[PDB]
Amino acid sequence: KKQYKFFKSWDLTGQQQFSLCDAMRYLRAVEVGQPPLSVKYEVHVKLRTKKNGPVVRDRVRLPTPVKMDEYRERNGVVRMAVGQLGFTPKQLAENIRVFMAKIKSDIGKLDDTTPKMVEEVVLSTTHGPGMSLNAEFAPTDDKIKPEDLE
Amino acid sequence: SRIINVRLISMAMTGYFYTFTRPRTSLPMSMLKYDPIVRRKVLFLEQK
Amino acid sequence: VGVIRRLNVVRELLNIRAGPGAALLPKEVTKVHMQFAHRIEEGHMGPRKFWRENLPKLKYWNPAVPMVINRTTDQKGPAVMTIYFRDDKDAKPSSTPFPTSSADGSSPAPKPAQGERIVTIDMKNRNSSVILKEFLDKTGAVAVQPTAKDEEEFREFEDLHRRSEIDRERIRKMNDAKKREKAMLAKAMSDAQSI
Amino acid sequence: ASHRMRLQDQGVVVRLLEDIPKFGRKHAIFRIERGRMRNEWFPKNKAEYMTPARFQELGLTRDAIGEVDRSFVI
Amino acid sequence: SRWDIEYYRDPAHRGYLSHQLAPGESPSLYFKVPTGGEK
Amino acid sequence: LARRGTRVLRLMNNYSYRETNWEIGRLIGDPGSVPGTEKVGSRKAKFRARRRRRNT
Amino acid sequence: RVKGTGVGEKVKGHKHERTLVAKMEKRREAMLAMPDLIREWKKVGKRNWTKFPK
RNA sequence: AUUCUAUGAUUAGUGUGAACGAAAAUAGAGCAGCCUAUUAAAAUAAGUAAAAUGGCUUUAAAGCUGUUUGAAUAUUGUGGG
RNA sequence: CUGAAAAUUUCCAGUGUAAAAGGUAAUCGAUAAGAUAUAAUUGAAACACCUUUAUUUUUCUAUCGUAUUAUUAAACCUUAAAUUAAGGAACAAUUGUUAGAAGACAGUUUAUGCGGGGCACAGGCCCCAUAAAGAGUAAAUGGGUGUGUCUAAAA
RNA sequence: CAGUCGCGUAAGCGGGGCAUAGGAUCACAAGAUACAAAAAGGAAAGAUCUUGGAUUUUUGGAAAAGCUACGCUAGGGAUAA
RNA sequence: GGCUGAGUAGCUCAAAGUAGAGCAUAGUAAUGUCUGUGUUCGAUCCACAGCUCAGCCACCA
Ligand SMILES: [K+]
Ligand SMILES: [K+]
Ligand SMILES: [Mg+2]
Ligand SMILES: [Mg+2]
Ligand SMILES: [Mg+2]
Ligand SMILES: [Mg+2]
Ligand SMILES: [Mg+2]
Ligand SMILES: [Mg+2]
Ligand SMILES: [Mg+2]
Ligand SMILES: [Mg+2]
Ligand SMILES: [Mg+2]
Ligand SMILES: [Mg+2]
Ligand SMILES: [Mg+2]
Ligand SMILES: [Mg+2]
Ligand SMILES: [Mg+2]
Ligand SMILES: [Mg+2]
């Protein structure tokens, strides 16, 4: 009977976000031995958008190829790969900034009636858990440092 | 109710405007008027 | 799909940092290699559980060492793992050539360099336990101990599964009771039409 | 939601001098309704008001106030 | 105040605070003299 | 390009430098005609192009 | 040490003074696009025009 | 410090209007400071300051106030204006 | 849409109750077999598994609200020097706030013009005549179906 | 007169309509100006310019129904029988 | 001035995998989603803009 014009927006005050390097440490372990060429990351970005508004149907040419890439908003979220398993944090980092900017550039390019603002950024693999992403990049643990490997 | 008072806003973003009346059952107004701020004739368009 | 839903589903899958198989390997080790078959036959179930249960716990505390796997379809293939234990007293050799994982045996065990001495460990028709202990005692490494917060993580999710299984059967008893009831209603409609 | 709401009292802080069932153990500090404390507990000497002076003598601070334990059992 | 300071801070009025200024500085406490050139 | 790219900042009131609105107006062109209304092309040139496109 | 005019303090500036450079730039931008706006308005025509401020 | 008179002032300001109407300051009359008050009184002030609401006063501040709520601890910058 | 556990998404065809998209070719089977999935078939769309979202439904929890019941188990109220008494009872009552509401009561308005006043009608503006060859010129004087508009110019 | 636009070969013409028929302040609202800013930096609320909404129709601009034969006062042959 | 809810057979009313049943019209038959523009395989349905509107606050200076 009741109806709302918005997508459910949960409270993030108690969320546990991870830095990009701290996250890959968790993911690279679950993908031990998996073919890096057949295991790629993925990002789901929840947007504070209204159901009535339009949708995004633009394309993006990332710096490094993962397969021009195509992305589309289906329901208050946008899902697309961002890098293979063998991607180093330096390469994977900019590979994400190019995706968020192309979005925020298309949002501002859109109408001002309901500017769709981002709420959270998730990161997962083809066999990994969905973990939240923090704006930070470096690991919180002082013992670990940027390390690249298979 | 048949005639409304409209405001033609300057497209030079100078804040000057001209006010004219026109029937509701008509198209918006658009004119080439003189802007006293920049002292040049620019294009004025209806506010709404 | 609330934030706490995704949060509990994650923190439970974060047992990678736990007691079972986690340990801080020494800097003497350089890299690891393993090769086993796809299926579980002719003594091949041991390595599989070692790959899905304890092996991931090493890369968390040892994210610098490359641990690669080479699967194959030959079920009789030798399920053996090599450990490049010797790094030449940490001489830091230039071991640039090294393969990558695969699924058809395309990345076999390469020959070690001059400053590397591998350590063979066979595993066939043997349990992961005997295979695990053989890895730690041989590759001398200190086992990390969990913190009290980790004990709560195990205790919390453990008590959670009690509530879950208590609900899995409960909701199951309402659906089957309905399925049965809905089927009973349909039978009456079909029977009534026959009359 | 609004920028101003109806002002409400949260209760009075008291330290139980006995061990009342269904609220808390002895020497338990929490915020209880003024009615129960004023009419039932204080006359029967079941609790005492935790005035700022009382906090000093007992050595505790205002950051020691607990919550009511409805599940408490004797 | 701002106005009273700026008045006696400029050399045009021979303000007694003008000595605190540099040759390139402006009397105003908020505005600055822009730079000429192409860049 | 040089004219439209120039910015003359003139001393005004309260030690403020800004571009005068009238100078901003003369950037597009000199006064006398409204820029944009003048026809850029010539009818004769348009006739020559029409024949060229037909010849080819 | 009073606000603004005190030692180490900086004058905030009036609102019309803070947005003075951001105001003349908007006016300058609109004039540069004036010839292209009148060309698209004299070609499209007064009736077929559909772009209006909001 | 308080009090009395004049100027400030048919001013600031308020109010649709009619009208109402300060203070600083200045001059004069008086002059006195204190808590051990020259008559016997503080262990330095909490339901208090303040807020919302209904009113008074009023220039929207400050001040008074019924109802419902409700702080902090000294220039080493605490509290009021 | 307070959150948590669990579950649910049927046009024909389709192995069958396909929620949607994105990623993937292996996943499960303690060592012996086979079940899933991919393939192929069907369809607009093809499935395991890992993710992020959508719809709906239970219990728990949070909130709000109604109805009822109990209460020297010292709220309050009533009789009562006024009590471990009797009864009512979270009502009533009082305070503050809010809405509705009796000329019951109070203040004030209800005008002026007009061949006396009452009833009635009347109040600004435009054209013509009366108006006496400059201009002006009255009357509850004569004419008028007069007037509170229209109008961006183009297909 | 200055500014800068249209038409015209040109002279020149254009500050709405062949002429004669509908309102202010105040308050409010939308733009500009950069004046002042109650210690100071800002701001609020003000000031100037442009513009809009009025049977403000008692239209130089009050939010407004009656009876008195129970009647009262001040005046008026300036008024009726 | 400002938001909100509605529009389908001639007339009534219904209903994202449909347009139904009455009455009217000629026992037997036929009758339609305000309009344009979008999304999704597909829209009475979701969305956007108008048209008609009604309803509720506000200007009434
Ligand atoms: K006050
Ligand atoms: K009783
Ligand atoms: Mg209360
Ligand atoms: Mg005055
Ligand atoms: Mg004191
Ligand atoms: Mg007070
Ligand atoms: Mg104050
Ligand atoms: Mg005070
Ligand atoms: Mg009366
Ligand atoms: Mg005459
Ligand atoms: Mg005459
Ligand atoms: Mg008229
Ligand atoms: Mg000031
Ligand atoms: Mg008059
Ligand atoms: Mg007049
Ligand atoms: Mg009689």
Curated annotation (Swiss-Prot), chain A:
Localization per record: Mitochondrion
Transmembrane segments: none
UniProt similarity note: Belongs to the universal ribosomal protein uL1 family.
Function field: Component of the mitochondrial ribosome (mitoribosome), a dedicated translation machinery responsible for the synthesis of mitochondrial genome-encoded proteins, including at least some of the essential transmembrane subunits of the mitochondrial respiratory chain. The mitoribosomes are attached to the mitochondrial inner membrane and translation products are cotranslationally integrated into the membrane.
Summary of subunit composition and partner proteins: Component of the mitochondrial large ribosomal subunit (mt-LSU). Mature N.crassa 74S mitochondrial ribosomes consist of a small (37S) and a large (54S) subunit. The 37S small subunit contains a 16S ribosomal RNA (16S mt-rRNA) and 32 different proteins. The 54S large subunit contains a 23S rRNA (23S mt-rRNA) and 42 different proteins.
Protein name stated in the entry: Large ribosomal subunit protein uL1m
Species assigned in the record: Neurospora crassa (strain ATCC 24698 / 74-OR23-1A / CBS 708.71 / DSM 1257 / FGSC 987)
This protein's encoding gene: mrpl1
Swiss-Prot record, chain B:
Keyword Ribonucleoprotein: yes
Cellular-component GO terms for this entry: mitochondrion; ribonucleoprotein complex; ribosome
GO biological process: translation
Keywords: Mitochondrion, Ribonucleoprotein, Ribosomal protein
Domain of life of the native organism: Eukaryota
Residues spanning the membrane: none
MF-aspect GO terms: structural constituent of ribosome
Main location: mitochondrion
Annotated localization: Mitochondrion
KW Ribonucleoprotein (keyword) present: yes
SUBUNIT field: Component of the mitochondrial large ribosomal subunit (mt-LSU). Mature N.crassa 74S mitochondrial ribosomes consist of a small (37S) and a large (54S) subunit. The 37S small subunit contains a 16S ribosomal RNA (16S mt-rRNA) and 32 different proteins. The 54S large subunit contains a 23S rRNA (23S mt-rRNA) and 42 different proteins. bL33m stabilizes the tRNA acceptor stem in the E-site.
Family: Belongs to the bacterial ribosomal protein bL33 family.
Its job: Component of the mitochondrial ribosome (mitoribosome), a dedicated translation machinery responsible for the synthesis of mitochondrial genome-encoded proteins, including at least some of the essential transmembrane subunits of the mitochondrial respiratory chain. The mitoribosomes are attached to the mitochondrial inner membrane and translation products are cotranslationally integrated into the membrane.
Protein name from the UniProt record: Large ribosomal subunit protein bL33m
Species per Swiss-Prot/TrEMBL record: Neurospora crassa (strain ATCC 24698 / 74-OR23-1A / CBS 708.71 / DSM 1257 / FGSC 987)
Gene symbol of the encoding locus: mrpl39
Residues of the full protein shown: 7 to 54 of 59
Swiss-Prot record, chain E:
Cellular compartments annotated: Mitochondrion
Protein origin, superkingdom: Eukaryota
Coiled-coil regions listed: none
Protein role: Component of the mitochondrial ribosome (mitoribosome), a dedicated translation machinery responsible for the synthesis of mitochondrial genome-encoded proteins, including at least some of the essential transmembrane subunits of the mitochondrial respiratory chain. The mitoribosomes are attached to the mitochondrial inner membrane and translation products are cotranslationally integrated into the membrane.
Family: Belongs to the universal ribosomal protein uL15 family.
Record text on subunit structure and interactions: Component of the mitochondrial large ribosomal subunit (mt-LSU). Mature N.crassa 74S mitochondrial ribosomes consist of a small (37S) and a large (54S) subunit. The 37S small subunit contains a 16S ribosomal RNA (16S mt-rRNA) and 32 different proteins. The 54S large subunit contains a 23S rRNA (23S mt-rRNA) and 42 different proteins.
Protein name, UniProt field: Large ribosomal subunit protein uL15m
Top-level taxonomy: Eukaryota, Fungi, Dikarya, Ascomycota, Pezizomycotina
Gene designation: mrpl10
Stretch of the intact protein here: 251 to 289 of 312
Curated annotation (Swiss-Prot), chain F:
Localization (cell): Mitochondrion
Residues in the signal sequence: none
Oligomeric form and interacting partners: Component of the mitochondrial large ribosomal subunit (mt-LSU). Mature N.crassa 74S mitochondrial ribosomes consist of a small (37S) and a large (54S) subunit. The 37S small subunit contains a 16S ribosomal RNA (16S mt-rRNA) and 32 different proteins. The 54S large subunit contains a 23S rRNA (23S mt-rRNA) and 42 different proteins.
Entry's family note: Belongs to the bacterial ribosomal protein bL27 family.
Function: Component of the mitochondrial ribosome (mitoribosome), a dedicated translation machinery responsible for the synthesis of mitochondrial genome-encoded proteins, including at least some of the essential transmembrane subunits of the mitochondrial respiratory chain. The mitoribosomes are attached to the mitochondrial inner membrane and translation products are cotranslationally integrated into the membrane.
Protein name, UniProt field: Large ribosomal subunit protein bL27m
Taxonomic lineage from the root: Eukaryota, Fungi, Dikarya, Ascomycota, Pezizomycotina
Gene that this polypeptide is encoded by: mrp7
Residues of the full protein shown: 281 to 336 of 447
